[PDB]
Amino acid sequence: GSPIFGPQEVSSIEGDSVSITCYYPDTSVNRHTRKYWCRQGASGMCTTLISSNGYLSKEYSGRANLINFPENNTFVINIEQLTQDDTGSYKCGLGTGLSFDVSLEVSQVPEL
Ligand SMILES: *[C@@H]1O[C@H](CO)[C@@H](O)[C@H](O)[C@H]1NC(C)=O
């Protein structure tokens, strides 16, 4: 099935911020479980970059937040100071399991 939903593709420009909302099923277990944002890598693993246990990758020091909103069965990942190096294939999810694939594209600032 389709337990998690979010934005399939997120397009931004260098310097921008994004706010990515992931939706989960309306259950107590899901409201209180670990939430995560991870980047899919060439090895096949999805490396956690931020989680609701308070974990943060050094790649996101000073520029990211993950906020759980149990009151509407969502959580939000905020990512700031984007650069082209943030382009990639990500997942938002619950647990370690339930997840949704997000493609983030960060393009160059257009020439004037
Ligand atoms: C969920 O609730 C939070 C807190 O009130 C709100 O800021 C956010 O917009 C809501 N999310 C959605 C998808 O309605």
Ligand SMILES: [Mg+2]
């Ligand atoms: Mg590009």
